């Protein structure tokens, strides 16, 4: 709905939450359709959410054993860095991705004592707690971010954009203040006219 309100009908949002263009875009269309972090970080959360919901669907359809469901959820939570791409738009998630990797070493070498190397470990409870605490701290982030996006859709952006000073333009703002001080002091020395 949000893509189509912005006029971006040449971008197709897949059912697995993959966002790909439907044609070769003009440069004006690439400028317009360049979505930000809060769209994609929201879109990658739904990619993560659907990927977990789909395994319970596959379990419920009969296609997947209950051990494969436990192993499937364990595979998702430990491989979000290669199944989603959430790191591209919020790179603080590499703490959570490396926590689920470091938890997997603890779980596997206690699970696989006197067992061979193989897939079927589904003790997904430690890695589940990581993402539930990742979701704990990004609720206030994305409510501020997407709330700024939707109100900028409904209302437009403000016309009172005052630019703060920066390293980029400190030499530019210095001369504007320097020219005004010289122009004041001469205009006060002037007698008239």
């Amino acid at each position: 709905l949000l893509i189509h309100r912005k006029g971006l009908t040449y971008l197709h949002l897949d059912y697995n939450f993959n966002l790909k263009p439907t044609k070769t875009l003009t440069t004006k269309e690439r400028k317009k359709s360049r979505l930000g972090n809060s769209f994609h970080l929201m879109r990658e959360l739904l990619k993560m959410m659907k990927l977990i919901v789909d395994t319970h669907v596959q379990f419920r359809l009969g296609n997947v054993d209950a051990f494969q469901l436990a192993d499937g959820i364990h595979y998702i939570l430990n491989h979000i860095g290669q199944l989603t791409g959430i790191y591209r738009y919020k790179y603080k998630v590499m703490h959570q991705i490396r926590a689920c990797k470091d938890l997997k070493h603890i779980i596997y070498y206690k699970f696989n004592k006197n067992l061979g190397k193989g897939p079927g470990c589904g003790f997904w409870q430690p890695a589940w707690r990581v993402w539930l605490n990742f979701l704990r701290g990004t609720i206030p982030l994305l409510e501020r971010y997407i709330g700024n996006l939707i109100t900028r859709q409904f209302e437009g952006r403000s016309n009172e954009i005052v630019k703060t000073t920066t390293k980029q333009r400190l030499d530019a703002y210095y001369d504007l203040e320097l020219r005004n001080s010289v122009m004041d002091d001469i205009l006060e020395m002037m007698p008239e006219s």
Binding site: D14, Y15, L45, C121, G122, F123, L135, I139, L142
Partner: protein, 193 residues
Amino acid sequence: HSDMASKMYNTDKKAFLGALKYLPHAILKLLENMPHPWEQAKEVKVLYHTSGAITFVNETPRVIEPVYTAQWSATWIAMRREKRDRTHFKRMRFPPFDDDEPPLSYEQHIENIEPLDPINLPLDSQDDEYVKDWLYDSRPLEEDSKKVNGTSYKKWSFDLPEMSNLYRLSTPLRDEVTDKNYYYLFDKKSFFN
């Protein structure tokens, strides 16, 4: 609200669009109430917008911590018995659906079928008789008026044979250290130093 093409849906499209800031909270409530491996299915209490915009899982998953430890410990045993004697473990393919096919409806597809058996350890009767009737429930001992306060499910209280039985199931995942002299220079005060 599948094909919102009429003029009547113009107000409901703003409701879909203004709910996107609340969507990360709906993913936290859905993933925390995810079914544990010893459950076929789980009824959750939900709160939904009347225009079908957002669906929050309006529950918090509260457990008895000795019961919850023994449930994950029995699945720890049940999954190491599985990986020991399975000839070949087929991990499923991810993503479990193609991105062109839509998420198939619950009622035409999922609801009509028998679910499947979950991960349940067989619970030998002479050694586990105090827990085997209620261990793999959704909320264990929820309607038992003497073990819990009620269906609000707070403030449990057990007897000695039930408490030692959960202790015996939990031995894959318990602490297994009883002296505090083990943690001599390995406590958090030494970690701060």
